[PDB]
């Protein structure tokens, strides 16, 4: 019957979480520092690119602004809290609180 390659599954799992959660993981790798995710979350209202690292596990969050337009920044800057433009370190258990904060902050009218 139907056969899914390990590769094909990754693309299906990704595709699901974009529509489900507004999150799209483009790349993952391991290095000496930890495990790293290149990430975009949001909708039509607001998109935020960022990098996620895992290192008791700490999370490192790094905002990526290179792909945003000057406008989008302006909207973003009025949309996002200050700390969300900063590079952060927080414990794993707070990650879903982070994800919610992000999605609310993008959605906020402005």
């Amino acid at each position: 019957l139907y056969f899914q390659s390990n590769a094909e599954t990754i693309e299906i799992i990704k595709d699901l979480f974009e529509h489900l959660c507004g999150v799209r993981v483009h790349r993952t790798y391991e290095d000496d520092t930890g495990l790293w995710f290149d990430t975009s979350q949001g909708s039509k209202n607001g998109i935020m690119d960022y990098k996620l690292g895992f290192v008791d596990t700490e999370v490192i969050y790094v905002p990526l602004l290179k792909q945003r337009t000057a406008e989008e920044l302006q909207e973003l800057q009025k949309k996002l809290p200050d700390y969300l433009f900063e590079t952060l370190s927080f414990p794993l258990r707070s990650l879903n609180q982070f994800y919610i904060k992000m999605s609310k902050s993008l959605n906020k009218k402005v």
């Binding site: 909708s43 690292g53 490192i60 952060l88 370190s89 414990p91 707070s94």
Partner: peptide, 30 residues
Amino acid sequence: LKFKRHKNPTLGERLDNLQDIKKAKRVENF
């Protein structure tokens, strides 16, 4: 304004990671 969806490891990337660790401000709650 509507954001547009964008279409879908280097030494520099590794290095930049190390910097990012060092700069990063620890926070515990949101």
